[PDB]
Amino acid sequence: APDSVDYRKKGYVTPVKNQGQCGSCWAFSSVGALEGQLKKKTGKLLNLSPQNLVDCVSENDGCGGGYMTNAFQYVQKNRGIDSEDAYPYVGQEESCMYNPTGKAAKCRGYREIPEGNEKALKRAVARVGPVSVAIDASLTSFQFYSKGVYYDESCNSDNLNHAVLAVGYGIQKGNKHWIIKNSWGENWGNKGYILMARNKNNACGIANLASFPKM
Numbered sequence: 494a495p496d497s498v499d500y501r502k503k504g505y506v507t508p509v510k511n512q513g514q515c516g517s518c519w520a521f522s523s524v525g526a527l528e529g530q531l532k533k534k535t536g537k538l539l540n541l542s543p544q545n546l547v548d549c550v551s552e553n554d555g556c557g558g559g560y561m562t563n564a565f566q567y568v569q570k571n572r573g574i575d576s577e578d579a580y581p582y583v584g585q586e587e588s589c590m591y592n593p594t595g596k597a598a599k600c601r602g603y604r605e606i607p608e609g610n611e612k613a614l615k616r617a618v619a620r621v622g623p624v625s626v627a628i629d630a631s632l633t634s635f636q637f638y639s640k641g642v643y644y645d646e647s648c649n650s651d652n653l654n655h656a657v658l659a660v661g662y663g664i665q666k667g668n669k670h671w672i673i674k675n676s677w678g679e680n681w682g683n684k685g686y687i688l689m690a691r692n693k694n695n696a697c698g699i700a701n702l703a704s705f706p707k708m
């Protein structure tokens with residue numbers, strides 16, 4: 494694989510959204526992954542609907558929680574996801590109003606990275622595009638990230654509690670990293686983004702609950 498990857502520079506990645514108080518992190522992660530695969534296939538980028546996922550993915554718990562695979566599996570069986578334009582984010586769990594006219598992406602299926610395999614996730618990101626990853630984001634050191642490559646020996650790989658999007662990887666001051674899109678708005682982190690430590694004994698369990706859709 495290449496040394497540098499950054500799918501933001503290829504137009505795959507939409508702006509940094511804000512989930513708010515609602516714990517719809519999985520939905521923002523899922524949408525991020527589909528958005529990437531939409532641009533690759535069609536040439537056109539747009540915002541897909543996190544609210545479509547929150548309201549209609551009955552196998553997940555809306556703002557309470559959820560998995561990305563379940564949201565991808567939903568878009569496959571449903572034969573669509575609406576645009577943000579067609580179906581906008583309100584910040585609560587409520588009734589499904591999927592309108593197949595406002596369809597924007599479909600999904601052929603999904604794939605999962607092997608558990609605790611950062612090399613596999615690296616190969617995935619390089620070839621596919623923005624990959625959905627879950628992590629431990631409970632630490633204070635995570636909350637108030639501003640610059641550099643992030644790492645903390647507290648970061649429990651087995652306590653996976655927050656879904657984000659791996660949009661790339663690289664190196665910065667000899668610290669290999671994953672380029673990560675959060676959904677806590679543009680004023681968190683470095684413009685919404687964090688660079689988390691790559692090949693550092695699976696830092697915050699970056700490789701444990703990782704997956705992508707095929708479009």
Ligand SMILES: *[C@@H]1CC(=O)N[C@@H](C(C)C)C(=O)N[C@@H](Cc2ccc(O)cc2)C(=O)OC[C@@H]1NC(=O)[C@@H](NC(=O)[C@H](Cc1ccc(O)cc1)NC(=O)C/C=C\CCCCCC)C(C)C
Binds near residue numbers: 519656
């Ligand atoms: C999205 C994350 C989010 O918005 N915020 C997280 C913060 C920034 C740490 C967060 O709150 N995450 C957890 C709760 C939590 C907080 C702190 C610690 O130390 C641990 C957990 C959360 O539930 O947030 C919602 C989103 N996260 C997920 O969907 C993730 N899933 C879970 O965290 C987990 C389910 C699970 C994961 C791994 C397992 O092996 C088994 C089960 N959720 C729960 O355990 C909570 C279950 C039910 C809560 C019901 C609340 C009812 C309120 C009325 C996913 C892996 C991406």
